[PDB]
Each structure stands twice: as structure tokens, then as C-alpha cells.
Design an enzyme around this catalytic site. Sequence first.
Site, PDB file in Angstrom:
ATOM      1  N   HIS A 191       0.822  -1.202   0.000  1.00 36.04           N
ATOM      2  CA  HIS A 191       0.000   0.000   0.000  1.00 36.04           C
ATOM      3  C   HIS A 191       0.859   1.256   0.000  1.00 36.04           C
ATOM      4  O   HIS A 191       0.577   2.212  -0.731  1.00 36.04           O
ATOM      5  CB  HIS A 191      -0.928  -0.033   1.209  1.00 36.04           C
ATOM      6  N   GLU A 198       2.363   1.756  -3.464  1.00 31.81           N
ATOM      7  CA  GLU A 198       1.361   2.244  -4.399  1.00 31.81           C
ATOM      8  C   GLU A 198       1.117   3.736  -4.227  1.00 31.81           C
ATOM      9  O   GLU A 198       0.740   4.419  -5.185  1.00 31.81           O
ATOM     10  CB  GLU A 198       0.072   1.449  -4.205  1.00 31.81           C
TER      11      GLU A 198
END
Lengths: 454, 79, 95, 95, 176, 354
Positions: free
Chosen positions: A60, A63
Site C-alpha cells: 500500500h 502504491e
Amino acid sequence: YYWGSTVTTEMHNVSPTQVTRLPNGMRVATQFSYTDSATVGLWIDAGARYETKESNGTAHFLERVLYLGTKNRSRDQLETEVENLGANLNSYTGREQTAFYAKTTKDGILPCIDILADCILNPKLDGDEIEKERVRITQDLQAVNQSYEELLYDKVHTACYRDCSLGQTVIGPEENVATIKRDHMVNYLYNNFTADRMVLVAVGPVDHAQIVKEAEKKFANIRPTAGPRMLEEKPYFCASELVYRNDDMGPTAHIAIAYEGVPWRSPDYITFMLMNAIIGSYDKKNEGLVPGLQSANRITQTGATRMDVGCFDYYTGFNIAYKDTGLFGFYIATDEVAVEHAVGDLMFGVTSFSYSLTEEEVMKAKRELKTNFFSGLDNTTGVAEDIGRQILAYGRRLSPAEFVERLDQIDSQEVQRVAWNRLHDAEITMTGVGPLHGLLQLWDLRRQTWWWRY
Amino acid sequence: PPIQKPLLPSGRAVLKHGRSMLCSGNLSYDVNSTIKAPECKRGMGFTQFKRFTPVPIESGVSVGNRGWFFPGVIPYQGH
Amino acid sequence: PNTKRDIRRLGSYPVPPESKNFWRGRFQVPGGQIQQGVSPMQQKIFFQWWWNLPTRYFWRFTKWSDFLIPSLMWYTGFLMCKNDVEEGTRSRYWY
Amino acid sequence: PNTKRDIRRLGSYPVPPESKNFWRGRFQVPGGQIQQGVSPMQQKIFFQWWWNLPTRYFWRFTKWSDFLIPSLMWYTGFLMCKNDVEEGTRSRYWY
Amino acid sequence: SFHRAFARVVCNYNKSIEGSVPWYQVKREKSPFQQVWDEVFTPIWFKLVKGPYERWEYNALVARYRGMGIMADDAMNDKDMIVERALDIIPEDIRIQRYRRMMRGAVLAGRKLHLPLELQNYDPMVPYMAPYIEEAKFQMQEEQELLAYHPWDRRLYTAGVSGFGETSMHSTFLTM
Amino acid sequence: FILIIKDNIILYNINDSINYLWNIGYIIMVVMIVQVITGIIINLYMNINNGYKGIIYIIKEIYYGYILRYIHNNNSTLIYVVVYLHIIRNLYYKTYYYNILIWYSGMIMLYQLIIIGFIGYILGWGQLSYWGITVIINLISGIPYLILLISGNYYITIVTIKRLYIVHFILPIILIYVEIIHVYYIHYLINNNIVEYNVNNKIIFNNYILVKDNNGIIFILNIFILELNNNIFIIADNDNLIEINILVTPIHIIPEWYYLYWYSILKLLPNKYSGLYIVVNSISIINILSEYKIVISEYKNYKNIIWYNQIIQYISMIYIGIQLPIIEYINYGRYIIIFNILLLIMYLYPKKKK
Ligand SMILES: CCCCCCCCCCCCCCCCCC(=O)OC[C@H](COP(=O)([O-])OCC(O)COP(=O)([O-])OC[C@@H](COC(=O)CCCCCCCCCCCCCCCCC)OC(=O)CCCCCCCCCCCCCCCCC)OC(=O)CCCCCCCCCCCCCCCCC
Ligand code: HEM
Ligand code: HEM
Ligand SMILES: COC1=C(OC)C(=O)C(CC=C(C)C)=C(C)C1=O
Ligand SMILES: COC1=C(OC)C(=O)C(CC=C(C)C)=C(C)C1=O
């Protein structure tokens, strides 16, 4: 009972999806469409599930930092270049799949491929960018800054999959977020973002040959493969309860109940899609053309009558599929005093599939399922998601005609057989947040998966 | 195949009052857009549970009145 | 029922007629709680009886020992009465 | 109870528990009415029985006369049966 | 399975009678036997029994309505669900006069009195409710066909209702 | 009534911390129903004109009549055991301090039960029963002419049996009605817990408490079946199988074991009425044991020393009742009565401040 074939000539009139495997192992899939806009992106077979407990949250974080500058660009230059092309870069991260897709015009297709390749292959994970994102991720991590639908989505996985990595959340625990560094992200890129796990999807005014040539040129230096994933047994489904009783957050209670579902490639997956459609969704604040009291949906109609007030402020079914497991259930947002009626009715509805489901309800559900699936394929991004998600899930894209062909075979009897085998007298997991005095024990709710009648 | 839309169709107009396809911004990410792809602040997947109806929930609002009661009148034993 | 603050309900949905007693036993949970559990179908159902066996019987016998001194005084009286009855019968009759 | 339109209540005050049946027999009066009366303590309490006496019994006997023809056919049958029984007994026996 | 076969028989027998004209919309010529019966019996039976008996009853009914001062349609009991659904949609003018007539009738009947003859010269068989009865039946038939075509399953004895179909709470003995 | 049943059995919430001493009441209700059913069925074959010969005809001629006869006698013993144990529990956890209304409703049933059992004994029409009633009835011999109105003659005869039998038939049905009034207050005034405070630990009844309550009742059934068919414990005096003879007095005129506490009280006190009055005190003073207190406490979960000495006082008095009227036992028993008055004063008295 069989009532004929609903496949039409128009279903066959769709441009084919051409999928080719590059020598490095990267699949390139494209579909031509008569549009002036396109969507080109990379659907990767990475996610939180494929992270370890100590590194959960790295994917995460990565990203969130992949578009903050490359080794050949800077954040300002990169953002300026995309804006000049009249394009926008998007990205998401899930448990099992990830994507980095750009929505651009026709002239920005190949230029955007270059931008995405640079971000994925040469990310400049600057420390300053990481530290600023650490604050943003930490603030988001706070449950006060998370919606109750997001909270219960995560807690359903935590409760159901205590023994495996699917229970991990995408954002990760706060302890890991506090400690993630560039080296963590660099390792994750090296191990997971490999050619064998990537699919380049181009939808729009595109030519397969040209896309393939550009893809091979730009992704030449990608790592060809990584070691095969460790073989594991079926994710064990834990029939548990994770309820956060809070009588200081208002009158509305949020309750999610889950059964064990089926994997993507299961022969029964389409049956579970239809069962999800039969459950449907209902909101008192958006009832539609048909009122609840006169709805064809049996759950909605009976619920709308309870106490002359209605026992469902909101509810929706959910059917979540992973490579080797799935979750099937419903989510409820209802008044505190109505929770017992609400969970009781939706469980009675799911139990009814195994005893008394009418052909009428099935046929209506087929049409609304097909009306939802086809409408999702209207824009290029919708098509691109469908191609990328379907190749990762199945290794191929199911045509609309094939989906309708397989759905034609499914009838009330088939739904009854599947429900009797998997959902009747089955173990359930309940999760909730809010005023939940009316929520009974798990064993009490689990007895409602079978009937004394019939 | 995946389902990309909520089981409850909106049934409302996408473009806002007075706003056109030319002046609505970019409907994919504009804040006022009714079809903006949601934000993955905590990851992807929560949209399967999300309530996309804009109006906040009014707990206990009645929807099961068949015309038997006036607003503000409390039924007694269903009569 | 519980206190009027405990049974005060946050929701405006009417109390179902079959759940009157249930909602008269409502508690206003302060600060929140995180309740967890597992279905009995996925658990050992007899082990806890064995695991808690020694402590259960220790803490039971230690409490019941409070009555020992009372018990002994009462038994002493029972024996005194029995012997008094016998000697009295042998004295009134029994040449 | 009465129709759902009749029992629909204008007021928002809750129905008293002892008056449940009373308010399930409510009527929605259309157009209004002006009801009047006097206490029985200031009225003649037996006169009306006398005043209505002739008409009450006239309209009762005129309605009950509908059954005259039915009554006569049944009595004719009762007499025929009685005589048939007697002649049959005198024929079977009675030399 | 023998149930699966029966389901095909039922499906095929109903598919073969779709669009059939109802028995009352078929131009029908009576059988010769019925014609002979309707030329010997019917005439005499009407002149001697039916005619006189049914005029005797009808004239009495008109007199009873005139005595009460009510119309024939006033006599309908609203415990009938078609009557109730019709009375929902009658205009206020009709509704007001209907209530006053029924009130006067009950007063007279209770006090063993009759309407003065001066007020009795009216036709009590005027069908003023007919338009609304027909509308109510249409509404009910739509609900029957579109919402009640199957014996639905519901959770039993919950929310004050038996779950067997009734919609009012505390409307049965077992639902108290 | 289905909704009522669902509200009081299926969605009834009870604390999860209760012991098996909270199952005694369920057993009373079940064993009570059994005593009514067996009584009505026995009545189908019984002639109250001679119940000595009638009981013989049931056990020898009726098919499986022995089951009915012995269940009805032994299940009475069982009823009183469970009731008396239900009171001992209520005293230990002082479940009368805040739930007095429940306690009052229960005491009414206790009074009714005391009358039902005694008259049922006399329907046996045996020596002990005849002489026992002849002794009790002569306690109200002071109220002028009332013995004659109750007996129906100058001595107990079938005339008395025919009237007491109607009280024995009907009074149990009224008891069942008071059981509803009792369960009504219990459900409104929530039950007490093993802990003195009130905690949010309640669970529904049908899925949990009824399964546990049945494990309890089936445990008692195993034991009751052994007594029912093998008489492991002597719970019925043998002298009730002797034909009545008004001329000869039984070896010992005693009641059933569940009336021996009050029999002893009446045989210990030197004045007949004083004895009757001390029996009233026993079944009345226990209804006001928290009324004079003034502290914010229920005196619960202490060592309960006073409670233990009271429970033993009951057992010891039952022993003295079995024993013949030897003078020594009378003196010792009078001390036990004085001690009971003192223990009961301890419960009643409020405390001053240091
Ligand atoms: C050659 C032939 C050889 C033949 C060999 C045959 C061998 C047979 C062996 C059989 C062994 C069975 C073992 C079972 C173990 C598993 C237990 C279990 O699962 O329990 C849970 C299950 C309930 O589960 P749960 O509720 O989750 O847990 C229960 C408790 O919370 C858990 O706590 P807990 O541990 O305390 O639970 C134990 C038990 C404990 O229950 C009791 O003990 C109930 C009775 C309480 C009074 C106890 C008085 C004790 C007197 C002791 C005297 C000692 C004398 C010592 C002499 C020494 C001489 C050297 O609890 C219950 O059973 C509950 C019953 C509820 C009854 C409901 C009504 C209650 C009324 C209120 C209380 C009573 C008031 C009146 C009495 C007041 C007395 C002052 O309990 C049962 O239902 C079990 C019933 C069976 C109990 C054990 C029976 C042992 C029998 C041994 C026979 C040996 C025969 C040898 C023959 C040799 C011939 C040569
Ligand atoms: C609270 C409930 C009841 C109890 C405590 C009770 C008690 C008893 C007792 C102790 C006996 C004496 C048994 C023996 O002779 O040793 C008896 C006898 C009898 N009872 Fe009951 N009884 C109850 C209710 C009923 C009911 C409802 C009936 C039915 C009308 C009934 C019918 C009989 C009959 C006929 C006898 C005489 C036969 C016998 O001796 O067994 N009883 N009862
Ligand atoms: C016919 C005899 C009676 C029956 C049927 C009976 C039944 C019951 C039942 C079913 C309960 C609830 C379950 C429990 O907690 O065990 C209970 C509670 C209670 N009973 Fe009785 N009972 C009887 C006798 C009595 C008597 C004689 C008294 C008073 C001396 C009494 C006082 C109480 C009290 C105080 C409670 C509440 C206990 C607590 O607080 O939970 N009962 N009874
Ligand atoms: C006052 O009521 C009585 C009791 O309840 C408190 C008893 O415990 C007892 C004692 C019971 C047993 C089983 C020894 C009896 C007999 C009694 O009379
Ligand atoms: C036969 O002797 C009996 C007694 O003897 C005095 C009793 O005390 C009692 C108990 C009396 C009361 C008032 C509790 C009974 C019932 C009895 O049968």
C-alpha cells in the site's frame, strides 16, 4: 427448470480481446473500441495477501509513492507531463491484485505506456516523499478516519481468516507503517512486480501489434520471473465473532454476516453471483420505482413490513472471491432496535435458497445481474478492469455470450443444490460495529441457517 | 466475472443541475461527480459493502406505512 | 427492568412485541467493548471442564471450610443429646 | 376493528392501554354532527316505552306475519302425521 | 423423479390453453334439450313460484330500505375488503350523505321507529357505489396477480404477525 | 400466546453466570405438572369411599397401576425436596432483599402446598393418616363448633374424605395459576445473579439455559427413577398400610417427613396453641427479614454463618420429630427453638454505628 437461451446476436457483436504472451512472460491484452479515449495500465498479481506479517503495509505504501517521481523524472515533471497529455494516472491495491492504469486520449496511449513503465521499473522512493506519506497513511489508519463500511469489510477478513494472510489488511498495522522504509519497498518491487505476474491492458482506439511492440521495448529490463509462491492449504474459515459494541456512536448499527464462499475458478461461482443478485440491495433513502412494501425481492418486501416501519435502513449482499477461497454474505446498516429482525430476515432469505426459491425471483435476478454486468462494460476503464481482473482471476476473459450461456443453465434447482451443499446448516461469521444489544450470540444466529418446516 | 457496480442501481441523473458534459469537470475523479471512482485510502474491496446512496441514513424512518397512519402518530398494537 | 438510563434506547425503531423483556434488560455500555468468540463446532467442548477442575474444587472447599467450626459444635450437641437420652431411659426404667 | 381509515387517529397522544378496544372502534365523522341530549335525572324515563308501544308491536306483528304460510304448512303436516300414526296403530292392532 | 414429470405435464397443459376465451365470452347456442326445458318449465315456474316469491321479497326489501331512509348500497358492510377499498376513494360529497343516512337509519332502527312517509318517495336501488366498487376490484386484482401469485415463506410469529400472510399486528389469537 | 411464549422463553435473557441452583425452579414446575397428571389419571381408578382397598386395586389389577401409585407418592416427596431446597437457596443468596414480590408469590404457593400434601395423605385411608388428621383438627378445637363444620361429623369418616378430596383436586390447579404470577414477577423483576451487582452478561434462554436446565432435570430423573422402582430411601411410613381402627392408637402418630419440622414444634412447646402459634411464626417471620434494614447493602456473599446454623436447625428439628417423646429430646429441642428465634432476630435487626 429450463426456459430457453437468452443469448442474442448483439452479444456476439463485440470486438475480440487479443491476449499475447511476451517472451519475458508478460501478457498483453487489448480490445479495440470506437472511442476517442483509452485506458492503458498494468494489472499485477500482487497484494497484501502476499506480504509477510512484519512487512504488511509495504504494498500500500509503495502504491502511494510510485507516482511521486522516478529516476528519470521528478514529481513536478511527471505531473506536468501527464497533464499536458490530457491524461490522469490511477492506481489501487487489494489483497490479491493491484493495478496502475492511466486514462488518456488516443494520442496519449503510447506516451502513457512510457510513463507507467518508468514508474513501475525505476521508482525513485525519495525519503521525503516516504515521510510525508507516512503521516497521511497513519492518519488514514486511524479508525476514526475510516468509514464503518470500510471497517467491517476489513474485520470480516480478520475474523474469517485468522490462520492465513488473507486476514491481513492492505494499509497494515500501525506498528509496521511506522517502520516501513525504502528498503522494504525496494524488496517488494523486486519480489512481486515481475513480468510473469503482470498484464498490460489497452482498451480503446488501439492496435494490438503496436501495443505489443511498445510493451516489449519499455518492459525489456523487467525481472522475468520470481520464485513460485509457497504452496499452502485451503484458507481455513473460522466461524467467529468480532463485534465492537459502541453505544456512543449514534443509533445506526452496522452488521456483516459471512458464509464460506467459492474461489474464482469454482464451477459454482456464477451460481454464487446469481445468489448475490437475488439477495440484492435496498436503501430506505433510494427505494426506486417499486416501493419496499411491493418489491419482488422477498427479503426487501418482508423487511419493509416489519413493525410498519421497515427493519432495513440499508442492506446489500456481497460475494468476494479469491484464488482458493471466497466469502458470501450480507451487510446491514439498521436501527439499533431493528437488528434482531434485520439479521433474522436476511438469514431466512439465504436459508430459503435451500428450500423454497421461485423461478420468478431467479429470472428477475438473472436480468438485473446481466443489466449490472453489461452496464459496467460501457466505458474503457470498465472494460480495462474487466479484462485485467478476469485474466488474473481466470487466465482468460469470459465473453458476454459465454457468461450468458453459463447463466442460462443455472436455474432455481441449481441454486437449491448449491445452497443445500454449501450454505444450509453452514458455519457463519458475524462482525459488527455500533449499538448491538439486539445482536444475539453466533450460535443463535447459526441455527437460523436451517428450517424446521419443509 | 467481477461486478463493478452496486447491486442497487442509482436511477438518478449523472450530470448535476446546470452542469454539462463539457463543464462537469472530469467525472472520473471530480469531487462533485456522482460516478467518481472511489478512493483507495485503505485499499480496494470496500466498495462491495459501501452504501452509494448520497442521503445520510435516518434511523427508523418509516417505509412500511400502507396509509394506515398519519405522520407523527404512534401505532398501538398495530392499530 | 434495568435502570432507566440503561434501558433508554438510542434507536427510534419500535420495540418488537416478542422482545419486550429483552429490551428491558438493555445496558448502556460505557467506553465500548470488543467481544470475540468461536463457534462450538470448531472448539474443544469438554476440555475446559478438566482444565478448571482443580481450581474449581479448591476454591469451593476453602469456602465451605468456613462452616467447619459451626458444624463441629452442632455435632457435639448431637452426641451429647443422644447420650443424655440413653442414660435418662436407663435411669427411668432399667433396674 | 373498524376500517383503517376510520381508526386512523388525528391526535399524536398515545392510546391509553385501557382504551385499546375503544379506539379500534373509532369512526372518521364526515361533514360533522351536532349531538345533543339531556341527563336522565331531568327527563321522563318510562314515557317513551308507552309512546312507542303501539308502533313497536304493529311493525313486529307485520314482519312476523311473513311466517304465517310456512307455519300453516307445517301444522297441516303435523296433523296429517298424527292421524296417520293413529290409523296405522288401529290397523296393525285393534281387531 | 415423478415430480419432475408432473411439472412438465402442468407446464405443457397450461401452455396449450394460453389465450383461451373465457366461457362467458363465447357465443353459445343452448342445447335443444335446454331449449325444450326453457319453454315448458321456466315459463310456468316463473308465473307460479319464482316470479311471485321474488317480487314478494324484493318489494319487502325496498320497503325496509325506505323505512330506514337508506339506499341499497348503504347496507354494504365494510368488513368486506372490496367495500373497504372502495370506501377509501369515494368523494366527500357522497361520503357525507352516506354517513348521515346510515346514522339516521340506525337511530330509527334502535328506537323501533320508521321514516315519515313524507320522506319515503325515493328510489333506494340507485347504484351510487358502482364506479368505486369496480375501481377497487381492479386495484385488488392487480395486487393479487402481481404480488400474491405464490404461497410465500416468511419468518413466523415475528414483529407481531404470524408470518402466514396477515399484515396487521396483534390481529390473531396466537399473535394476541 | 405464541408471541408471549417467544417473549418469555425464546428471547428471554438471563445472566450467564448462574449456577445449577438456578435450575431448581424449572424442576419444581416440571415435577408439579407430573403430580397433577398422575393424580388425575389415578382418579380414574380410585374410589374415595375406601382408599385403602382402592390403592390395593390400583397396584394389583390396573395395568401399570403400580407406576401411577408410586410416582404420585414419590413425586410428592420430590416436590417438597425441590421446594425446600429452592427456599434454602433463596435464603443463601438473599434473593428476597430486592425481589420481595417474587418471594411473596412463592410463599403463597408454599402455603397452598402445605395444605395439598396433608389432605392427600388422608386419602390413603390408613391408620397413620386417620389418627394424624384427628390430632391436627383438634388444634382448632378452641374455635367453637368449627371442628364439626370441617369434619362433617363428630369423628373423621368418609364424609370428611369426600370434602377434603375436592380441595385436593382443585387447589393444585390454583397453585399452577400462582406459578404464573410467580414467573411474571421473575421476568419483570430480573433474577438475581451469583454476584451482588448487575452485569451485561445475559444470554437467551432456549438455546442455553434450557439445555442446562434439562441436564439438571435428567440428573434428578435418574435418581428419582431408582427410588421409584427400588425404594432406595424410605420416604413413606409403613404404618399407612394398616387398616384404620378407631379403637387402637398407632405406635407413633407422625406426619410425612416434610411435615416433621412443624410436628416437632407442636410436640415441644408445652401449650397446644403456643405450638400452633410458633408454627405460624416459622412460615410468617421469614417474609420480613429485610424490612427493618437501613444500609445500602443486601448482606450478600458474606460467610453466611447465620444461614448455615438456620439450615441445620431445620434438619435437627426434623430428627427430633422422628424420635419418640423422650423427655431428653424435648429439652434439647426447646433450646433449638430458642436458638432459632435468636438467629431470626439477627437477620431482622438493623445495626447501629460505632
Ligand atoms: C465392578 C463394577 C464396576 C462399576 C464401575 C462403574 C463406574 C462408573 C463411573 C462413572 C463416572 C462418571 C464421570 C463423569 C465425569 C464427567 C462429568 C461431566 O461431564 O459433568 C458436566 C455435566 C454438566 O456440564 P456443565 O454444566 O458444563 O458443568 C457442570 C459443573 O459446572 C461442573 O462442576 P462439577 O465438577 O461440580 O460437576 C459435577 C457434578 C456435581 O453435581 C452434584 O454433585 C450434584 C449434587 C450436589 C450435592 C453433592 C453432595 C456431595 C456428597 C458427598 C459425599 C462424599 C462421601 C465420601 C465417602 C468416602 C469414603 C472413603 O455436576 C453435575 O452433574 C451437575 C448436576 C446438576 C443437578 C441439577 C439440580 C441441582 C440442585 C441443587 C444442588 C443440590 C442440592 C441438594 C444437595 C445438597 C447437599 C448438601 O455434568 C453432568 O451432567 C454429569 C453427571 C454425572 C456426575 C458424575 C457421576 C459420577 C458417578 C460415579 C459412579 C461410580 C460407580 C462405581 C461402582 C463400583 C461398583 C463395584
Ligand atoms: C401440588 C400437587 C399435588 C401434591 C403435592 C399431592 C400430594 C399427594 C399425596 C402426598 C398423596 C398421598 C399418596 C399416598 O397415598 O401416599 C396424594 C394422593 C392422591 N392425590 Fe395428590 N397431590 C397433588 C395433586 C393432585 C391432583 C391435581 C390430583 C388429581 C385430582 C390428585 C389426586 C390424588 C389422588 C386420587 C390421591 C389418592 C390416591 C393415592 O393415595 O395415591 N393429586 N396426593
Ligand atoms: C410451587 C413452588 C414454586 C415454584 C414453581 C417456583 C418457581 C420458580 C422459578 C421457575 C424461579 C425462576 C428460576 C430460578 O431462578 O430458579 C423462581 C425464582 C424465585 N422463587 Fe420460586 N418457586 C416456588 C417456590 C418458591 C417459594 C416458596 C419462595 C419463597 C420462600 C420462592 C421464592 C423465589 C424467589 C425469591 C425467586 C427469585 C430468585 C432469584 O432472585 O433469581 N419460590 N421460582
Ligand atoms: C421452613 O420451611 C422449611 C425449609 O425451608 C427453609 C427447610 O429447609 C426444611 C428442611 C428440609 C430438609 C430437606 C432437611 C423444612 C422441612 C422446612 O420446614
Ligand atoms: C400429622 O401431623 C402433622 C403435624 O403434626 C403436628 C404438622 O405439624 C403438620 C404441619 C402443619 C402446619 C400448619 C405447617 C402437618 C400437616 C401434619 O400432618
